[PDB]
């Protein structure tokens, strides 16, 4: 509840899940740099890890940093609701998952060929690079 | 060396768009040397408006 000082404990650059995080960002919004971690998700893992949101990224100790990456990789074990997850009711094993920085584009990709392998209409328009959700195309999306 | 001149008579709207007004000014001190000058903003009589230069009359504007 007052200004405090520290020396040598701040860490300017963090590395979490093979992603570089700026250490002078507030912890809740620093994790949003990790792809697959939005503002809504980052708010809860810090609250489940008892990391008060009033701390910058470099303020955290190693003990706290490992406690966060553990929760993100195992969300359901920490009373994180299934509906709150990124990839729930998975295609192959049917369980609720939350894919992260490097895993996200791999399983996002696997969904694309899975649409394209069966040659569905939605997968085809994805192949063409067009809008797949029915949006009009006669007058919008003319950039490159 | 600015001079102040109270207006005593609004002659009429002049200029192409009618945005400038002919007016008859009288000096606060030395109540003589009455001059006709053009003014941009809205003007009633008895408005105290100062002149950067005094020795110049005015006639109808384009």
């Amino acid at each position: 509840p007052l200004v405090v000082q520290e020396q040598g404990s701040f860490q300017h650059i963090l590395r979490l899940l093979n992603t570089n995080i700026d250490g002078r960002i507030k912890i809740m919004y620093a994790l949003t740099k990790i792809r697959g971690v939005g503002r809504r998700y980052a708010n809860l893992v810090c609250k489940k890890a008892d990391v008060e949101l009033t701390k910058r990224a470099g303020e955290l100790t190693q003990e706290e940093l490992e406690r966060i990456v553990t929760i993100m990789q195992n969300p359901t074990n920490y009373k994180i609701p299934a509906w709150f997850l990124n990839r729930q009711k998975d295609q192959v094993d049917g369980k609720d998952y939350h894919v992260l920085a490097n895993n996200l584009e791999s399983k996002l990709r696997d969904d694309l060929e899975r649409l394209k392998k069966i040659r569905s209409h939605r997968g085809i328009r994805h192949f063409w690079g067009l809008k797949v959700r029915g949006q009009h195309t006669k007058t919008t999306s003319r950039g490159r | 060396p600015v001079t102040l001149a109270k207006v005593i008579k609004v002659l009429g709207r002049t200029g192409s768009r009618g945005g400038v007004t002919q007016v008859r000014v009288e000096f606060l001190e030395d109540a003589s040397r009455t001059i006709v000058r053009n003014v941009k903003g809205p003007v009633r009589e008895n408005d105290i408006l100062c002149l950067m230069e005094s020795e110049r009359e005015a006639r109808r504007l384009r």
Binding site: R39, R40, L44, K48, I80, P81 | -
Partner: protein, 141 residues
Amino acid sequence: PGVSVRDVPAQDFINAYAQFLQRQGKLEVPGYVDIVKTSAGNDLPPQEAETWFYKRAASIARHIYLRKQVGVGALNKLYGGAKNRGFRPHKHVDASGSINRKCVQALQKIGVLEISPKGGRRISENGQRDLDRIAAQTLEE
């Protein structure tokens, strides 16, 4: 002369009743308060994670004090706000039903409110007694 709830500013009265309700500790807080957002129109959960439920329950109690048989559907509309539809214009959307219903249900077992006849939720015989008390301990400074 006496003191009533109407004789104290609303904004700092709720901040005082919220403090009492947290320190008293008898109010039952549901287990999802650290996860949920107040309204579907909101995009983030409340910033005061430890205290937002107490303050909202304090707000609910004060709002019911000044009226007669307000329902839980009316509470969702009151605390609801303008939704940020992306490119479409803004619109008013009601708040979450469970959060308001749990507060009035939680407030019903702490003794401040009760189900009124012909619908709604009246303030209790003791509900008037204890709110007017908090008002007195608000304005002494």
